[PDB]
Amino acid sequence: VASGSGEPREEAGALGPAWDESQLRSYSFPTRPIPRLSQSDPRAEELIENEEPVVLTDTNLVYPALKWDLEYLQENIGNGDFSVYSASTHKFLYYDEKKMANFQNFKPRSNREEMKFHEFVEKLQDIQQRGGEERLYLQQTLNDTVGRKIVMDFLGFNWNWINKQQGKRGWGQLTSNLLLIGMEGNVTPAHYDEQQNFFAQIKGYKRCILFPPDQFECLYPYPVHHPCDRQSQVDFDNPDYERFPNFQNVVGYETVVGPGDVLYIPMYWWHHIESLLNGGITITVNFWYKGAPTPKRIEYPLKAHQKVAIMRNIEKMLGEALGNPQEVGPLLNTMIKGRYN
Amino acid sequence: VASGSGEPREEAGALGPAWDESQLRSYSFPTRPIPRLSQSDPRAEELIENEEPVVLTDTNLVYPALKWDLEYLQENIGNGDFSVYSASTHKFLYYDEKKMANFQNFKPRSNREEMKFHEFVEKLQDIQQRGGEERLYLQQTLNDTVGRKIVMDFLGFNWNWINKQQGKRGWGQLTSNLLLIGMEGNVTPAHYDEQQNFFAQIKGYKRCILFPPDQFECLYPYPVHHPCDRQSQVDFDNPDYERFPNFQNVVGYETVVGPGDVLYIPMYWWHHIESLLNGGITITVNFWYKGAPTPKRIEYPLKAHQKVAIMRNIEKMLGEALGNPQEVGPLLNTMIKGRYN
Ligand SMILES: O=C(O)CCC(=O)C(=O)O
Numbered sequence A, B: 001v002a003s004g005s006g007e008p009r010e011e012a013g014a015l016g017p018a019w020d021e022s023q024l025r026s027y028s029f030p031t032r033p034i035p036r037l038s039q040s041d042p043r044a045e046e047l048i049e050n051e052e053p054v055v056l057t058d059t060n061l062v063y064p065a066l067k068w069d070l071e072y073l074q075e076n077i078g079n080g081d082f083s084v085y086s087a088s089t090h091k092f093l094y095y096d097e098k099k100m101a102n103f104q105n106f107k108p109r110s111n112r113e114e115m116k117f118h119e120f121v122e123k124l125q126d127i128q129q130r131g132g133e134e135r136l137y138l139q140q141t142l143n144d145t146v147g148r149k150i151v152m153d154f155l156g157f158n159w160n161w162i163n164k165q166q167g168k169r170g171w172g173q174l175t176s177n178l179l180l181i182g183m184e185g186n187v188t189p190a191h192y193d194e195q196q197n198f199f200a201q202i203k204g205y206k207r208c209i210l211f212p213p214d215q216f217e218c219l220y221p222y223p224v225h226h227p228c229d230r231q232s233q234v235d236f237d238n239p240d241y242e243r244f245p246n247f248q249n250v251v252g253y254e255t256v257v258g259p260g261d262v263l264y265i266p267m268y269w270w271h272h273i274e275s276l277l278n279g280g281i282t283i284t285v286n287f288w289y290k291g292a293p294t295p296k297r298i299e300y301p302l303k304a305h306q307k308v309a310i311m312r313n314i315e316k317m318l319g320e321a322l323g324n325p326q327e328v329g330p331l332l333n334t335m336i337k338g339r340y341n
């Protein structure tokens, strides 16, 4: 069946339903649930190996961070600069700034702004106070500038477990940790990443809807050279079935993560991420790993994600070869019309 | 204007019109005429340099061959084997046999058959006698097996001129000479070649209709892996404007060549070639040269033929990468639909 996130979990000590159906937004497509399992369960091990998602409930991956909140973070995080995205709507579509050059009819809806942790917390309190509508999303890699207590927290993460995950899966190296702190209601729309991700939930509840790589045809990513490379063009709240007809065949896997849970988001899987409505602020930390190196003699049949890799390369190379990304489309069309379609 | 081949030329000594409009087949598109010039004319030199076609009237390129006919050729050409194509219609669509593997729903309309020069001449006389409908086209590279008088003829060709053409244009090496002998009415449908061609007419008259490389979009070549790679899909006698809508925007350059004339067919230019109706058998010899080597830093904007080269490579590589040519189309579609179209 398509229950989706399933029946909401009961919090220990009878503290009530963690959340309820009405904090979820409404969408056109059906979904089946990502399995929640224990890291000891061999089924979870089997899933990570086959590059399918799984929610792990007992890793303790970021145990020391479960105590983080705004106040504790203000007090310890340091005086470094924190990237903070802004938006006039719940949807935070992201831009790659290095690509804004080559698409001029691209004024952004969501601006970046550097600031200090305290400033972010002020802007948030200011907004919350006045009862404004505007939304913010802090997203910042963890680097040297951070307080000693945070460095201690960080050191208390379950390295033993994750490093064994990296080693068993052949993955490359931890490339970064990203800290995400967001306001209730905020959405990160569907996109895919090229790295393996352990997505570690800390404060609050997020609804995570994933689509496998094989559903490329239904999600209609932006062109590789467009600033929104790797994002879906389809507006989940108002989908345009004339432009994106196969969006009507899309089927997601969904789940709700809370404090202590870790979502394996396999490489190239689409993910759409929402912080529950009226559920407070949310906090998450990612663990991004370069995926395993591509093997020597490619075995057929190919995996979907490899076909996705191929399409990407074709677009990149055609962009250089022609000396201008804007010409990629007309040439692709010229190549198929009346020939392959 | 679109006269096309222009007013038929008058043969010397008042022997009458070489040919007339009614030996030409009828087509949907308009054409303007390829200039006829003298090899001494600097305009002709300018045309070959800019890779545009030109008919040269006084090269003497194959002067010794102007005396060839079936009888003289039978008597001297040798006992080697001659490739001979057969067809139940005036159109000789060609197959690349090495590619027939990977498209099984491809029974051929025109079969190849090895035979000896005399056999060809018999089969032709047999057919002509009985008053049959079936058509033959001899097409065979000139190789070592040939008679001494033919080797003498061949040695009498104007090497001095052509070799200076090769040298001034930076072209690579003569790759071959192809001998074409055909029956009145025979058509070679539109296709392009990857080499530079001096097309040397010997006996009879052929109507040559060329389209520049930039008209790729209107001629709809077969897929690179299909046996008819490099041929147009569009049936010139009954064009399907639903499948091939831009064929309605096509504009050819045409001409009629006779004994003594040489048509420069530049690399990548489409050419459609017909032996005039009720005009007797025709004879031609090609001179194929590898084109100049591709320069070091590619200057923008690119030439049409370079874009054509690019499309070809994209298709070849996608074929290997995916391990199966039949998958090239679905992936290309997946790549554009809703993304670039
Ligand atoms: O938490 C979010 O809203 C974004 C998560 C995400 O896109 C990722 O970690 O890959």
Ligand SMILES: O=C(O)CCC(=O)C(=O)O
Residues within 6 Å of the ligand: B180, B187, B188, B193, B197, B199, B271, B273, B274, B284, B286
């Ligand atoms: O003469 C013909 O019919 C074919 C000529 C041709 O295709 C060529 O020489 O490239």
Ligand SMILES: [Fe+3]
Residues within 6 Å of the ligand: A191, A192, A193, A271
């Ligand atoms: Fe992501």
Ligand SMILES: [Fe+3]
Residues within 6 Å of the ligand: B191, B192, B193, B271
């Ligand atoms: Fe040709």
